[PDB]
Amino acid sequence: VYTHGGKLERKSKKDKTASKVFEEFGVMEAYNCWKEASLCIQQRDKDSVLKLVAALNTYKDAVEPIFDSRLNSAQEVLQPSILEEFFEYLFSRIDSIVGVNIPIRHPAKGYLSLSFNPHNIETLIQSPEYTVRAKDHDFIIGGSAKLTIQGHGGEGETTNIVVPAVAIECKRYLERNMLDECAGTAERLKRATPYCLYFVVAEYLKLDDGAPELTEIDEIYILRHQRNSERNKPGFKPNPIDGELIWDLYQEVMNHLGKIWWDPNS
Amino acid sequence: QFNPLVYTHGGKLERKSKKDKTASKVFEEFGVMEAYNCWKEASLCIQQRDKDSVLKLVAALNTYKDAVEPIFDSRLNSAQEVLQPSILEEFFEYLFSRIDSIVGVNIPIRHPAKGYLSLSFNPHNIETLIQSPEYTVRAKDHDFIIGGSAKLTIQGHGGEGETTNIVVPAVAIECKRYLERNMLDECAGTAERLKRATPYCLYFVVAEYLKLDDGAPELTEIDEIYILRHQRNSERNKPGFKPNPIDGELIWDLYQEVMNHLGKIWWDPNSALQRGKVFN
Ligand SMILES: [Br-]
Ligand SMILES: [Br-]
Ligand SMILES: [Br-]
Ligand SMILES: [Br-]
Ligand SMILES: [Br-]
Ligand SMILES: [Br-]
Numbered sequence: 001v002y003t004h005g006g007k008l009e010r011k012s013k014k015d016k017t018a019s020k021v022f023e024e025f026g027v028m029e030a031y032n033c034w035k036e037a038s039l040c041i042q043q044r045d046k047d048s049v050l051k052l053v054a055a056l057n058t059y060k061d062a063v064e065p066i067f068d069s070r071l072n073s074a075q076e077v078l079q080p081s082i083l084e085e086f087f088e089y090l091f092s093r094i095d096s097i098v099g100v101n102i103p104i105r106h107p108a109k110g111y112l113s114l115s116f117n118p119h120n121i122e123t124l125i126q127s128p129e130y131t132v133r134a135k136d137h138d139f140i141i142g143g144s145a146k147l148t149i150q151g152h153g154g155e156g157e158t159t160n161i162v163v164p165a166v167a168i169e170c171k172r173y174l175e176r177n178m179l180d181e182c183a184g185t186a187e188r189l190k191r192a193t194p195y196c197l198y199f200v201v202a203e204y205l206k207l208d209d210g211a212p213e214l215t216e217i218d219e220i221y222i223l224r225h226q227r228n229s230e231r232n233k234p235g236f237k238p239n240p241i242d243g244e245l246i247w248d249l250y251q252e253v254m255n256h257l258g259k260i261w262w263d264p265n266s
Numbered sequence: 267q268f269n270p271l272v273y274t275h276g277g278k279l280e281r282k283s284k285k286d287k288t289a290s291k292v293f294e295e296f297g298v299m300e301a302y303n304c305w306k307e308a309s310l311c312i313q314q315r316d317k318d319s320v321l322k323l324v325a326a327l328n329t330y331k332d333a334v335e336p337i338f339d340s341r342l343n344s345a346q347e348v349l350q351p352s353i354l355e356e357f358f359e360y361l362f363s364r365i366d367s368i369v370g371v372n373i374p375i376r377h378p379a380k381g382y383l384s385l386s387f388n389p390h391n392i393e394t395l396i397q398s399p400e401y402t403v404r405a406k407d408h409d410f411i412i413g414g415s416a417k418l419t420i421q422g423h424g425g426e427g428e429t430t431n432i433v434v435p436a437v438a439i440e441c442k443r444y445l446e447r448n449m450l451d452e453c454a455g456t457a458e459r460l461k462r463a464t465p466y467c468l469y470f471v472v473a474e475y476l477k478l479d480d481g482a483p484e485l486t487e488i489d490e491i492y493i494l495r496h497q498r499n500s501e502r503n504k505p506g507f508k509p510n511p512i513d514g515e516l517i518w519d520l521y522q523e524v525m526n527h528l529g530k531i532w533w534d535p536n537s538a539l540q541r542g543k544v545f546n
Pocket of ligand 3: 112113133188462
């Protein structure tokens with residue numbers, strides 16, 4: 001898939017302003033170097049995961065100052081996909097670890113609900129119209145399925161859905177509005193798929209004068225251990241993305257993906 | 267199969283009478299099967315559904331309850347089982363047995379049934395999630411549903427469908443002898459769930475007597491609550507009590523509300539950019 005790469009590739013064909021900037025400041029080259037260094041790491045011991053994090057830090061240090069200063073709102077398109085593409089690298093080896101061919105490992109809309117909204121009494125009997133609500137998540141590990149409804153009139157109406165085992169939101173900074181929105185989604189997500197792990201990953205924290213809502217979210221990671229308001233202050237050094245957190249997150253995901261979950265009895 | 271007259275109450279008597287020798291003795295000695303047969307025959311024989319015909323169905327209902335409920339109450343008691351509550355259910359089956367031509371389609375469900383509430387996923391493991399993800403349909407028992415039935419199939423990468431029968435209601439009605447606090451709260455909770463699952467389902471709570479100790483006020487998602495006899499369940503206790511009959515005009519009001527609902531176009535995209543508004 002390559003979420004971040006795909007955004008760059010399309011902006012470079014389509015957006016004259018942004019393609020100019022990409023060439024002049026060497027974004028494509030830096031991106032290529034990040035991908036090539038990331039995709040060649042085969043193992044997932046602690047050291048390998050810390051190598052992925054170093055390449056991630058390097059890429060962000062190279063490219064985020066360009067996104068921030070050289071693009072307008074041409075760049076609240078570019079920056080957020082970096083973490084998403086990162087997770088695709090981190091979890092690109094799960095097929096051989098767990099012995100199954102996992103179709104979803106990228107941003108996707110995970111199933112929330114099925115409800116029925118027939119046009120009329122005829123329709124309700126013959127072929128009831130329905131809605132699958134799904135929620136876009138920054139990163140999902142899951143399966144895809146087909147959902148078919150059939151009435152008396154014999155034809156099946158089918159919808160493709162994604163069922164997550166893991167879903168991760170990825171943000172630069174976590175503020176009040178977003179964290180509340182995440183806690184509401186967690187509630188829906190746990191009714192729909194009780195065995196889905198739900199993580200909110202941010203680099204910076206920005207809850208100011210306010211108290212975080214820790215609803216049904218399994219973990220919140222603040223990768224740089226710093227407050228958002230430090231960013232505009234005089235001579236500011238951003239902490240790197242902490243490799244120990246990503247190592248912790250990796251282990252928790254993998255532990256979850258290898259376990260049993262549900263059982264008619266045991 | 268298709269069947270709008272399943273005789274829920276008749277079926278209860280018939281099974282009690284085959285299985286419970288004590289109860290079947292009581293049935294014969296006090297003429298319950300005869301009174302029941304008379305109720306069914308008078309109900310089945312009313313062909314129209316104008317106001318007067320609906321009042322006639324209610325009179326037959328009143329008569330049958332007057333005949334049989336004092337027997338259930340005093341001669342059987344806890345062996346009354348599902349006996350007394352099914353009368354109102356069988357009643358609604360009579361009331362709605364002829365809707366097929368008015369509405370233009372044969373309605374498959376018109377009986378107590380579990381209407382679909384939600385679909386959620388509970389895979390056994392990562393293998394199962396990809397191949398064939400296990401799931402749960404939550405559904406709610408209602409005393410009477412007018413609705414359709416559908417098949418829900420989920421399929422993973424390993425091809426084969428896991429199928430479940432569901433019922434999708436257009437109307438769902440709870441039927442009780444008396445309405446108390448616990449049941450009303452439980453009904454209000456179900457109404458919230460029921461409106462997310464099937465927003466175009468009409469939801470009614472019908473009882474004969476009211477038993478709300480508290481007059482504390484709660485808005486709810488129940489479309490109508492009918493107290494058929496307009497009395498309190500505290501009068502029933504008292505020395506020398508005459509029960510008010512089931513009021514025919516309320517049942518007439520309920521019938522008309524159901525029929526208006528079943529005739530309407532519920533979801534109409536083209537009828538929304540026409541008007542301006544989505545409702546009235
Ligand atoms: Br591939
Ligand atoms: Br595949
Ligand atoms: Br919902
Ligand atoms: Br018949
Ligand atoms: Br009672
Ligand atoms: Br629900």
